[PDB]
């Protein structure tokens, strides 16, 4: 199993 | 898995903190989402904080009530909310990746 | 906020027939990554919530074949394509495109038996 997926995008910095 | 604490009980006015420790996926990949259901079983947003720099966005309705951090070392994220009222009390969730934790209940009564 | 319409509010199934749940956003869920970030979860009676389908349409690890997510834009599906009584609870949609996050209202699978 791959990693999951986000649900979401990371937020930048 | 996402392992949360265990039940509160706060009264009126004070403060709650509860945790969730991270395991089984990179922690510091992935937005910590903690979310709030509500006795009719909806579901609502409150925040997340990203573990791989600290970056928090909130729910404007609990922006100055909760506050999310996140302990990279030990790989566990928390949230306090402050002021409680009766509106406050439900089951709240720690969410990241696929997983859920199992949620907190929080019983705001003195 | 982006509102995410969840429909029918409950589903009553016999085990085998096939199932399908309706999401729709009030605005697009397409990310200026090209990535469109729409979640569906299924919280079984007593239980926290799962992750079933990321990505509108990839389902995660362990989720069986049953299962199809579809969608584009603001229209999403959710599809079982025979009911197993394990399959009960109530799914959620779920957005992360937009600020706030948003949930849909939840659909109740119930199995009639």
């Known amino acids: 199993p791959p990693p999951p997926n986000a649900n979401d995008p990371p937020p930048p910095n | 898995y996402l392992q949360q604490s265990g039940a509160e009980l706060v009264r009126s006015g004070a403060s709650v903190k509860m945790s969730c420790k991270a395991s089984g996926y990179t922690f510091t990949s992935y937005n910590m989402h903690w979310v709030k259901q509500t006795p009719g079983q909806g579901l609502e947003w409150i925040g997340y904080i990203y573990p791989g720099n600290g970056v928090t966005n909130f729910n404007q309705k609990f922006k100055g009530k909760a506050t999310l951090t996140a302990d990279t070392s030990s790989s566990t994220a928390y949230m306090q909310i402050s002021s409680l009222t009766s509106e406050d009390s439900a089951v709240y969730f720690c969410a990241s990746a696929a997983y859920w934790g199992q949620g907190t209940l929080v019983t705001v009564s003195s | 906020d982006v509102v995410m319409t969840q429909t029918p509010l409950t589903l009553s199934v016999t085990i085998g027939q096939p199932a399908s749940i309706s999401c729709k956003s009030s605005?697009?869920?397409?990310?200026?990554?090209?990535?469109?970030?729409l979640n569906w979860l299924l919280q079984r009676p007593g239980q926290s919530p799962k992750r079933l389908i990321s990505l509108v349409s990839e389902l995660d690890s362990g989720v069986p074949d049953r299962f199809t997510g579809s969608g584009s834009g603001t229209d999403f599906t959710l599809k079982i394509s025979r009911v197993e009584a394990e399959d009960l609870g109530v799914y959620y949609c779920?957005?992360?495109?937009?600020?706030?996050?948003?949930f849909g209202g939840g659909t109740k699978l119930e199995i009639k038996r």
């Open positions: 605005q697009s869920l397409l990310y200026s990554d090209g990535k469109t970030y």
């Open positions: 779920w957005q992360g495109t937009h600020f706030p996050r948003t």
